Design a protein around this nucleic acid. Sequence first.
RNA 1: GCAGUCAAGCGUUCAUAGCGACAUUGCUUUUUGAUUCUUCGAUGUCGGCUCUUCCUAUCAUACCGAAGCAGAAUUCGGUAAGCGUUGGAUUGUUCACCCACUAAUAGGGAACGUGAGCUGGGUUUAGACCGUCGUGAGACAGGUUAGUUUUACCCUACUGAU
Lengths: 52, 136, 191
Amino acid sequence: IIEPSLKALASKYNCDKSVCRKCYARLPPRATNCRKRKCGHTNQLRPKKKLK
Amino acid sequence: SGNGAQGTKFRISLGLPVGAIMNCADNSGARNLYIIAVKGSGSRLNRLPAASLGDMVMATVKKGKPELRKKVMPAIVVRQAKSWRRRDGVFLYFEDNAGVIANPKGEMKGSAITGPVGKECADLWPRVASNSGVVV
Amino acid sequence: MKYIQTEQQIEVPEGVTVSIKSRIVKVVGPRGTLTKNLKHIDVTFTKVNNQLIKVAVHNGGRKHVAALRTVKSLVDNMITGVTKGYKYKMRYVYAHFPINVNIVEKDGAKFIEVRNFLGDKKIRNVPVRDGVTIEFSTNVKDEIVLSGNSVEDVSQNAADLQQICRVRNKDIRKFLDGIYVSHKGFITEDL
RNA sequence: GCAGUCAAGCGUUCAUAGCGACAUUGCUUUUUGAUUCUUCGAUGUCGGCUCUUCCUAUCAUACCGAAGCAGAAUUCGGUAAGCGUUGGAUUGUUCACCCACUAAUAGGGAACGUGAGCUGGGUUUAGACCGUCGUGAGACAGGUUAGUUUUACCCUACUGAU
Ligand SMILES: [Mg+2]
Ligand SMILES: [Mg+2]
Ligand SMILES: [Mg+2]
Ligand SMILES: [Mg+2]
Ligand SMILES: [Mg+2]
Ligand SMILES: [Mg+2]
Ligand SMILES: [Mg+2]
């Protein structure tokens, strides 16, 4: 059972996240800069890949 | 004691290093087997890997029929000569070193086995005990 | 640029009565009591007329003035917590293996115990903090309800339960299995 | 040798999952040159054996993040040098190349670690042979054979002992 409501619940935490290109760190969806200070707070992000 | 080994073997004394020629217990054409490696051995500088009763080893037939010669293949030890202690208490040793040839699943290629076979080897390998004659 | 003086305004309702000395904020009301040590912040509190309190900073920078507004929201949440209360709901998500959760005792400490998460033999104990009170919701399938005065405790207790059930060495996009936070609100209705 | 920046293209679809031309900025002293500062009243010149420690640019092992990650098997990256990193056939070899096991068969430094520690197969004295060159004595960093490895009881360091 996928269940329409409970699928959207789990996808909020697992799927709907951005990722930093330099350090591969997980980030919030509408962020502008990476929070890690090792990569120098870079502004080069992308969306996490969709499943099929 | 691993490649399709039904059960676990308690430690025993190591009789056969690499370079030893044990006899061939089975009746599949081969006469004697030159051990080259031990399946499931450790690694320490300078130490030769040493087989024992019930182990599986890589062997080349030196003396025997021409089909079995010149191809590395697996085998199982069935008699030792270096004595070992059993948990029951007694020490024991066979008269000579011997071993059957068998594919890596652990199944006998030969039909029958001549001479006695160890009880430690018989329990660890089911298909050896099927053709086995005397068990100790 | 060094701001000459800045300030925010905490509005106190008719029920509660708050007390501050040095920077130790006691807040008492109908639900219970709360306390908070703020001796790391450097601010000034001032009373005006019972239902209004004025926080202030004098000759502060940019990062100093940022922490001023934080203190307002901390003391506000203590006031909303002791009046209305907090109520965090969470839901189970699974495909094949049904998760069976129950509250268990251990030296009178009270732990949440998760059994058979994704078909496992390990039993996952999670401690229950002081103040928070857990109960399983009847007439809604596979739901839990945490509640207490403090936000800091209730939310953190939900987060621990949330984070004890991760799937390791798998594609987390595919394996959507866990106990997730559904809705944050208050205990009492109306407000 | 190792690492960035930019991004025309590759990647069914899509610059940047993984790759990446034309360009351009660096780090390193495990390569080789350039130089001739120190030593020609001599600092024992290859390799192997033995033994300790250090480096990280991490092969495996701990915990994690990405993926064109369904599972399985892999690929790219982070914290990490805590703990490991083999047995052989041929060659004096370093290097190389095969066979086998293995969790894994990562890379380096310490006067290109280490000869009053060993060994002396190699290089580089005198004997001798062949080939090419030279009128000849002779040459060859071409091939082959045989050829002396000395001294600690001193001060320090280390290990134990009053
Ligand atoms: Mg050796
Ligand atoms: Mg000059
Ligand atoms: Mg000297
Ligand atoms: Mg590093
Ligand atoms: Mg040297
Ligand atoms: Mg010396
Ligand atoms: Mg002539």
